[PDB]
Amino acid sequence: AVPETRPNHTIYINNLNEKIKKDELKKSLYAIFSQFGQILDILVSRSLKMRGQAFVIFKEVSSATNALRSMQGFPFYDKPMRIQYAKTDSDIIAKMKGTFVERDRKREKRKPKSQE
Numbered sequence: 001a002v003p004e005t006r007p008n009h010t011i012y013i014n015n016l017n018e019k020i021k022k023d024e025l026k027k028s029l030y031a032i033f034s035q036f037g038q039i040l041d042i043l044v045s046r047s048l049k050m051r052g053q054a055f056v057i058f059k060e061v062s063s064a065t066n067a068l069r070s071m072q073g074f075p076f077y078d079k080p081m082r083i084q085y086a087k088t089d090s091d092i093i094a095k096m097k098g099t100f101v102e103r104d105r106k107r108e109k110r111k112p113k114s115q116e
Contacts, residue, residue, distance in 0.1 A: 009061040010089040011068045015079040016044075016052025028076070029056055029067075036070050037063015043089065045096035052077070055089030 011033075016025055026042040033039050033056055041057030044050075058064045068083035075081075086092060094100055 005068065005085050007061045007065045007068070008085045008088060009058060009064060010086040011056045011058075011064045012053065012084040012086040012089065013055065013081060014051070014053040014084070015076070015081050016054070017077040017079065018052055020052060020077070021046055025052065025054055029054065032071070032074075032076075033058065033063060033067030036066035039063075039067075041093075043093050043096075045098065047096055047098065050096040055086040055092060057089060057093075 013029070022044050025044045029042045030039045038059040039056060040059050042054060043057065044052070044054035056064060056067055058067065064085060068085055071081060071083060073080045073082055094103070
């Protein structure tokens, strides 16, 4: 069983140099699919099971369709970014959360006060 790729509102990644530590990995996929449709939540993890891999959360499922098909094997980090729609990176986002905290506030990223 294997119905081609198919969109899922999110894509998957598994071809990033194994020497980066976030801060750029996402800043590099954000300035790439943002035009493919609309990036609004790229997530990466430095876990051993979650190497450079990472998924893209698009505002619309038609955006991942491009970030995944459009480039589909583009040049990135000296490696081919074989984009593969995620099997729902939502549960996978809390899965590699690196803790899995219940959390009850996932919407706007506004701070309650500018601390030091």
